């Protein structure tokens, strides 16, 4: 769809050519508001039903109910059999609808941005339309400080010429400018002149991908429409008043959403491990069905050859023993329906939601500062259990380990260090010396070379409101140490050196301001002195400033002293930032000025043009000094990192500082402690892969096992950017890097790039396969969080993209420590126990039915009344599972926060595997066998009562059902170590409910609700067999579990069990300062 033709006559393009249906034009729904939601209100039912029935289990339940609908498989009214499935579907639909409503409300708040598209024909009026702009056939004169709804080919502008500024912030970080439209120009007047006139035929090149290139054309009654002519999306600077132009290409969802916005979905590791268990249960059900079918067919053939009484009248087409075998298959599927998890998924989702709510309402991970009170939000209502299995953590230093509010510490001016900066500069500033002149120049370039805006509403104070923290810190420090930036109210800016209020002149702000590998931020200024000289001020990164200098006179000694000073500053954990000085002769200044003026608008590239202009103007810079600003680490970061290290969690840091200045920030973040060798790879006249392999050989090559892969109290690794780039370029280097990173616990990477961080996380997560976590604040952080198992965002001052595109939004790093340890550990333990006990109770029911099926010819007949079988996954035993999921604890949170070494069990995945699943299945089978066989052989008698009445199927069935409910509930209770009220209620409310149901349901007269069990209130509660069998089967079923649990606690204890015993029996122990505990710091 490359070509599109526009603007025949008047807005509202009713007719261009053809009729409709092929070009997708003129309100043909070619564009619409961005849909971050799931479905429509009308189409909610089909998509919701498809999503629910794509879970295999739900389709199985629907098939079972539909089979029950037919009279061949029917037992009771369809309402009872369909009620559990309907309830499950309703709960799941409500949950997903709530999530979709949250997303839709967020999207609605984001959208509806006022847009001033005018021109409709009373003849003129209305305008101020909704964010959903009218197709591609209208124009908008969008005012100042308003976001762009779509791309546009702006023709004219309120300000002089058709120049505009948009400040692309959601797509980049640097400033923005335009280069006019061209031929339309003055002929393309706004304010109904575009409506009165009718010209131009807009031409387009590629609607699919247009980033940094949006070329086009237009012909009136050929013109080179370019990117610098076409505004793209979501960008608002508006240094002018308003800009008017025609909307083309995207209406709402064609350009920027195409550029980015692919959000994946994430699932926990526990669910992926649970899926094979569901498959195994389904396989068991199928095997039971086929075995029952075979045996029933054989027995029915035998019993129909010799006419029995239960095989009479089988000489039909739907009752012969073969179709009877098929019906036995179907009824085996319909009889053991509890084995396939019905309410497991809804219960797990509810438990995860409540765990996320607990993560929210926690008061230990809530940040209060300056009135606002950030809370740890769980943006993903799942993944609450993957926090407890974290084995790798990747972090970005700035904004996460630091407060992003740095304060000036040391300033170097020529040759003397200085240590709210007042120091000896006041005692040294004494005029008539070269050092004093250099100091004046240093302070001038620090106080002028910026983009800071100053507020003069408080005389004497003059508060500064900058954009980047470094500029604010530098300007405020310069003001406090003398030279005060008076302001930039007009084109002329003023300075407040402590003699007068002398002022400079602003001509050409080289506003480059970092990024694009161009970290210089120079600015051309002219003093209003009678000489009126033209001099250049510049500040930027160390490398660019040092490479842009001169190589004569004493400047060589100046440079070497400055380099030594820079190294000394970096050694102390400071961020370096140099300053420069350049003098411009008037003639070259004005020639370059006119060259820059005519190159500002070029309609071709202009990016490399501006860069080359900047590189050309800088030829005689003179070094003035080297500033050093310290980034304040957040309160609790060192302790947090130490505790994470004492959990087996590897802590990588991808910092944006230099290697030396970011060696754990001078070993202060506890990443690189004492007595731990650090490996440094810097690529100095050597191959990165060769150096890495040589270091690996030197430090671990003595190991025999390591050599197979090749075919001091700790270790670390440092690789800044180029080792990383070359490792990801090649394969063997990547493998060696992965090995050396696996065999260490603190990898510090300095001066990294977004793609490099994402590739680090991808490498670890893919090759290793272990759980990973990423935390940050910037856009690079949003990328590395999207490409990670669990993502964490910090609501820093750099923006809010990371919080939006992350699973969790913490405010502090210590909050990450607490969250991870206590919440992940508890969540993993609770989810594992809950899933295992759910499978256990389902297996108990299915096993009792199967053991009866041994003694019925394998005819797949339910021993229990269908009421008891239909209410197993609900009513009887769901509350204990929910209680285990919610309120269960293995140890109090104080112990977990004090001794992080207990994190081994959750990190190593010792709580949920397949051996535990097999153990719980076997336990269920054993207990079901005990219950069924003991009660059966108890009821193998004449009366089982004093009145002589016969023992029929339902008495023994009801006794076994009550016993099974008691056994399941007391098993779930026995697997609880956090008995506080609610678990009592669950465990003694399930069996209480079944007892009440048996008491009341058996007194309903046969006049209504036949009930098939009329009399069990007289046949069970009055029988000694029932009252002495249910406690016996309960005790015998629970005894092996009790003994095994006691022996595992005593003979072969765990660390968690031992610490639980220590806390319970010895409350007067100082965990933090005990010789055999955290006092050892181990």
């Amino acid at each position: 769809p490359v070509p599109r033709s526009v603007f025949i006559n008047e807005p509202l393009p009713s007719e261009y050519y053809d009729k409709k249906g092929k070009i997708l034009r003129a309100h043909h729904f070619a564009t619409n508001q961005n849909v971050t939601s799931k479905y429509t209100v009308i189409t909610f039912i089909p998509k919701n039903l498809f999503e629910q029935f794509r879970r295999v289990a739900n389709c199985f339940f629907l098939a079972i109910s539909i089979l029950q609908f037919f009279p061949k498989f029917s037992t009771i009214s369809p309402g009872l059999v369909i009620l559990p499935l309907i309830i499950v579907l309703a709960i799941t639909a409500l949950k997903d609808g709530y999530e979709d409503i949250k997303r839709h409300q967020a999207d609605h708040r984001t959208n509806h941005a006022i847009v001033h598209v005018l021109g409709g024909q009373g003849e003129l009026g209305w305008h101020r339309t909704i964010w959903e702009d009218v197709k591609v056939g209208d124009f908008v004169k969008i005012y100042e400080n308003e976001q762009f709804p779509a791309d546009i080919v702006i023709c004219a502008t309120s300000e002089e010429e058709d120049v505009a500024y948009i400040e692309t912030k959601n797509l980049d970080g640097e400033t923005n400018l335009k280069s006019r439209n061209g031929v339309p120009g003055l002929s393309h007047l706004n304010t109904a002149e575009a409506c009165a006139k009718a010209h131009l035929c807009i031409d387009l090149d590629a609607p699919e991908s247009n980033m940094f290139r949006l070329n086009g054309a237009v012909i009136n009654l050929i013109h080179p429409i370019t990117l610098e002519t076409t505004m793209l999306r979501g960008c608002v600077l508006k240094n002018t008043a308003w800009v008017i132009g025609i909307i083309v290409y995207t209406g709402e969802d064609t350009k920027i959403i195409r550029n980015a916005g692919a959000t994946p979905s994430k699932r926990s590791k526990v669910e992926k491990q649970m899926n094979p268990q569901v498959i195994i249960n389904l396989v068991i059900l199928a095997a039971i069905a086929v075995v029952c079918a075979i045996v029933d067919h054989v027995n029915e053939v035998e019993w129909d050859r010799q006419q029995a009484y239960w095989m009479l009248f089988a000489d039909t087409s739907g009752d012969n023993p073969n179709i009877n075998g098929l019906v036995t298959f179907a009824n085996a599927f319909i009889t053991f329906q509890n084995i396939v998890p019905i309410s497991l998924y809804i219960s797990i989702e509810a438990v995860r939601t409540i765990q996320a709510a607990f993560i929210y309402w926690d008061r230990d991970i809530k940040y209060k500062k300056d009135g606002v009170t950030t809370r740890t939000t769980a943006r993903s209502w799942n993944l609450s259990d993957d926090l407890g299995q974290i084995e790798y953590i990747f972090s970005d230093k700035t904004g996460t380990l630091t407060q992003n509010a740095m304060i000036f510490r040391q300033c170097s001016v020529g040759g003397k260090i200085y240590t709210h900066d007042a120091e000896l500069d006041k005692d040294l500033e004494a005029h008539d010396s070269e050092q004093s002149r250099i100091l004046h120049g240093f302070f001038a370039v620090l106080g002028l070379c910026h983009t800071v805006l100053a507020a003069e509403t408080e005389p004497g104070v003059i508060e500064y409101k900058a954009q980047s923290p470094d500029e604010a810190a530098l300007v405020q420090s310069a003001a406090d140490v003398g030279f005060v930036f008076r302001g930039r109210d007009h084109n002329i800016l003023r300075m407040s050196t402590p003699f007068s209020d002398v002022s400079d002149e602003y001509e050409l702000l080289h506003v480059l301001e970092f990024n694009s590998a161009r970290k210089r931020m120079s600015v051309i200024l002219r003093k209003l002195d009678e000489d009126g000289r033209i001099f250049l001020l510049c500040k930027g990164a160390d490398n660019v400033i040092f490479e842009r200098l001169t190589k004569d006179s004493n400047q060589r000694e100046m440079r070497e002293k400055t380099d030594q000073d820079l190294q000394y500053f970096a050694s102390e954990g400071l961020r370096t930032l140099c300053l420069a000085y350049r003098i411009l002769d008037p003639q070259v200044y004005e020639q370059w000025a006119k060259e820059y003026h005519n190159a500002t608008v070029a309609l071709q590239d202009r990016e490399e043009r501006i860069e080359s202009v900047s590189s050309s103007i800088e030829r005689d810079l003179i070094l003035l000094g080297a500033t050093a600003i310290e980034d304040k680490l957040q309160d609790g970061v060192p302790d947090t990192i130490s505790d994470l290290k004492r959990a087996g969690i590897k802590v990588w840091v991808a910092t944006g500082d230099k290697l030396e200045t970011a060696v754990a920030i001078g070993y202060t973040t506890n990443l690189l402690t004492k007595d731990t060798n650090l490996i440094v790879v810097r690529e100095g006249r050597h191959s990165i892969g060769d150096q890495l392999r040589e270091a690996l050989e030197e430090f671990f090559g003595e190991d025999a096992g390591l050599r197979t892969t090749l075919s001091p109290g700790g270790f670390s690794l440092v690789i800044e950017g180029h080792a990383l780039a070359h490792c990801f370029d090649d394969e063997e280097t990547e493998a060696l890097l992965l090995a050396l990173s696996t065999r260490c616990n603190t990898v510090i990477c300095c001066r990294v790039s977004p793609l490099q961080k994402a590739q680090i996380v991808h490498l670890i997560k893919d090759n290793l396969g272990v759980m990973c976590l990423a935390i940050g604040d910037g856009a690079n952080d949003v990328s590395m969080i999207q490409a990670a198992d669990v993502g964490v965002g910090i609501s820093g001052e750099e923006g809010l993209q990371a919080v939006n595109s992350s699973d969790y939004a913490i405010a502090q790093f210590r909050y990450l420590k607490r969250l991870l340890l206590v919440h992940g550990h508890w969540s993993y333990f609770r989810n594992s126990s809950m899933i295992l006990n759910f499978f256990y109770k389902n297996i108990i029911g299915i096993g009792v039915l199967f053991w009866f099926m041994i003694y019925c010819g394998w005819s797949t007949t339910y021993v229990f009344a269908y009421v008891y079988l239909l209410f197993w996954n609900v009513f009887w035993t769901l509350v204990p599972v929910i209680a285990i999921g919610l309120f269960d604890r293995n140890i109090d949170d104080e112990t977990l926060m004090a001794l992080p070494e207990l994190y081994r069990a959750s990190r190593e995945g010792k709580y949920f595997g397949l051996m535990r699943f097999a153990y719980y299945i076997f336990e269920g089978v054993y207990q079901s066998a005990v219950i069924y066989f003991f009660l059966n052989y108890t009821y193998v008698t004449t009366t089982a009562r004093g009145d002589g009445y016969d023992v029929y199927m339902y008495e023994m069935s009801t006794t076994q059902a009550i016993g099974a409910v008691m056994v399941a509930n007391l098993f779930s209770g026995l697997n609880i170590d956090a008995w506080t009220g609610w678990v009592w209620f669950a465990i003694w409310f399930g069996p209480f409910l079944i007892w009440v149901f048996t008491a009341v349901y058996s007194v309903i007269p046969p006049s209504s609700f036949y009930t098939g069990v009329y009399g069990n209130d007289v046949f069970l509660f009055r029988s000694a067999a029932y009252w002495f069998g249910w406690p016996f089967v309960t005790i015998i079923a629970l005894l092996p579990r009790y003994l095994i649990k006691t022996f595992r606690q005593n003979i072969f204890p765990n660390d968690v069990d031992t610490m639980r015993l220590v806390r319970k029996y010895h409350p007067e122990v100082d965990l933090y300062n005990h010789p055999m505990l955290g006092g050892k710091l181990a």
């Binding site: 239960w310 009248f313 010819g857 021993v863 016969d950 036949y1010 505990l1077």
Partner: protein, 349 residues
């Protein structure tokens, strides 16, 4: 913790032992006489004399307090008679003479035991129409679509008792248990069994006496109720409510080998002597290798003579005692301390 596991096991055993002893004692205070009359058609003498029954036909389960040994009981005898000059249902009489070694206490019950009879089969357990039996006006199409799938209707005339359970009603009766040697004269005394009270007075509610929406000529009797009703229901609808045998039979048994009550006695004591019970063999079970039986048993507090739960309790008590003693010995040998901080991962060398 040992302090929570040894006392618990000891208490569990100390509680289990008396309960098991009581259950075993109650089961022991019960008598049971089992007589197999299935093979009475071919092996019994068909002349008028008697022959001692085979050893693997009768089983005596005497009480614990009885001094008479099992081997001291005379072998029961039987005879077979098939004379086609009596009413339908009593043509093949099997008379079994059995001896009661000691006076059976009051509350004596009579059961008939069936083996290899699968009432619990899926085709059989659900093969009954509750709404037809309750007497509500159920249309013919609903009968065709009901749970009485194999036996529903023929020629537009639905069966009143439909399904497989009603069709296979046990039509074998034992209308005599006579004492052949009493003490107070009366050379033969009949031990009066009452065929009322066999079923609990709550099963009769879910069976209607007479149906009102169909005339008593458009309903056909079940296929196997042909000898009892040769020309259909001429006397009216059968009173299924008022007969206890049908109600007892229409209660699906849990196991293939099941016993169903047939007549009971409460206020009479069975004397010591040789009796003679007449069984009207009309229900064939030999086709599917089934064996009928006659069970005369007394009742205790637990019920029948099944001392399985008591001995299971005793075995559990013995196991608990053994485990508790072993745990106490281990505690007294190596008393491992509580809160031991030497086996921790960061404490072990």
């Amino acid at each position: 913790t040992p302090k929570s596991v040894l006392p618990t096991l000891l208490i569990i055993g100390i509680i289990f032992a008396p309960i098991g002893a009581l259950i075993v004692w109650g089961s022991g205070k019960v008598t049971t006489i089992t007589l197999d009359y299935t093979e009475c058609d071919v092996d019994a003498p068909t002349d008028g004399s008697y022959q001692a029954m085979p050893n693997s036909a009768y089983q005596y389960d005497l009480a614990t307090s009885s001094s008479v040994s099992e081997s001291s009981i005379a072998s029961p005898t039987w005879t077979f008679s098939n004379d086609s000059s009596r009413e339908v249902g009593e043509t093949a009489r099997c008379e079994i003479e059995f001896e009661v070694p000691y006076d059976l206490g009051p509350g004596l019950f009579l059961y008939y035991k069936l083996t290899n009879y699968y009432q619990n089969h899926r085709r059989y357990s659900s093969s009954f129409d509750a709404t037809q039996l309750i007497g509500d006006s159920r249309s013919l199409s609903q009968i065709n679509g009901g749970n009485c799938k194999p036996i529903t209707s023929r020629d537009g005339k639905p069966y009143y008792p439909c399904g497989l359970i009603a069709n296979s009603l046990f039509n074998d009766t034992f209308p005599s248990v006579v004492l052949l040697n009493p003490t107070n004269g009366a050379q033969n005394q009949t031990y009066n069994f009452s065929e009322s009270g066999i079923a609990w007075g709550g099963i009769k509610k879910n069976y209607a006496s007479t149906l009102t929406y169909i005339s008593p000529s458009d309903v056909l009797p079940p296929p196997n109720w042909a000898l009892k009703y040769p020309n259909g229901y001429v006397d009216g609808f059968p009173n299924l409510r008022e007969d206890e045998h049908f109600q007892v039979w229409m209660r699906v048994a849990a196991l293939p080998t099941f016993r169903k009550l047939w007549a009971r006695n409460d206020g009479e004591i069975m004397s010591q002597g040789r009796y003679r019970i007449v069984a009207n063999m009309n229900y064939p079970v030999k086709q599917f290798s089934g064996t009928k039986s006659i069970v005369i048993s007394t009742v205790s507090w637990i019920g029948g003579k099944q001392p399985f739960l008591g001995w299971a309790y005793i075995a559990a008590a013995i196991l608990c005692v053994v485990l508790a003693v072993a745990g106490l010995i281990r505690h007294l040998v190596k008393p491992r301390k509580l809160g031991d901080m030497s086996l921790l991962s960061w404490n072990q060398p």
